[PDB]
Structure 1
Amino acid sequence: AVDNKFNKELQNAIYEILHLPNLNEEQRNAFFQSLKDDPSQSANLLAEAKKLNDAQAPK
């Protein structure tokens, strides 16, 4: 078991998601909540966030 304070993957996911340019605030906060619900999903959620970011690129 990995504790959240000792989980670099979780911490990096939160920080990266905070920076993504093409998400809206609702999406960002939903990701933050989903990470709280299950930190084991950090890799999946970060990948999902990046995919949505890229689909939502303005050009």
Structure 2
Amino acid sequence: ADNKFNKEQQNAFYEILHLPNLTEEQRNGFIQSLKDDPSVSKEILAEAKKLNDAQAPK
């Protein structure tokens, strides 16, 4: 059964890989969540983005 990401899921995955202000530990936790159930991508992405923005350099 083919488990290739649809565009919504792929976009989330790549955005999390590339968000600049996550630590490795933070990033890997979010990616692991998606690897386990990709249907939660939109919620996980929203969390990752908030954390990324909170940790932006000033």
TM-score by length of 2: 0.86
User: What SS class does the counterpart of residue 22 from structure 1 fall into?
Assistant: coil
Q: 4+ runs of 1 displaced by more than 2 Å?
A: none
Count of equivalent residues: 57
Please, what TM-score do these two structures have when normalized by structure 1? 0.85
RMSD: 1.3
Identity rate, percent: 84
**Partners of 1:13 and 1:42 within 8 A in 2:** yes
Unpaired segments ≥5 residues, structure 2:
none
1:13 corresponds to: 12
| Gap runs ≥5 in structure 1 | none
CA contact (8 A) 1:4 1:10 kept: no
Distance across 2 between alignment mates of 1:53 and 1:8: 22
